Nucleic acid binder design. Structure first.
Length: 73
DNA sequence: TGCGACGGTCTGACGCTCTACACAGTGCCAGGGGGAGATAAACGAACGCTGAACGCTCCGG
């Protein structure tokens, strides 16, 4: 029985702590952080040609000090 | 000037979380200027006391 237990791997977030130097969410399981949407993910969404989902994953769901609160409202 | 070569300069070196941590050897005091806190007083205000005074229902001889 390996120590890759499912109780430690599982992590989820809708809205939690945010970073300070830039207002994106921070990372990690213990600090309620969000998954990283890297460059290759953004390439995949451009290859689909989904401008709106990419825009909301880059501007709404992070990095906007006023958009996040308005979207939650 | 053409030649290699000599050299410095410069760049990145797939992706994520589960995990994830903190940081270490040599001086010393006196004189003087400001503002923080405690003090006792002060000019003005309104806060009370004085019941008085106006007016009412009143039980009444």
């Amino acid at each position: 029985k390996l120590h890759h237990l499912v109780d430690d791997k599982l992590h989820a977030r809708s809205t939690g702590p945010y970073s300070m130097i830039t207002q994106q969410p921070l990372g990690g399981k213990a600090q309620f952080g969000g998954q990283r949407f890297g460059e290759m993910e953004v390439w995949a969404l451009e290859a689909y040609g989904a401008a709106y989902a990419l825009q909301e994953l880059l501007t709404i769901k992070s990095d906007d000090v006023t958009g996040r609160v308005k979207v939650y409202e």
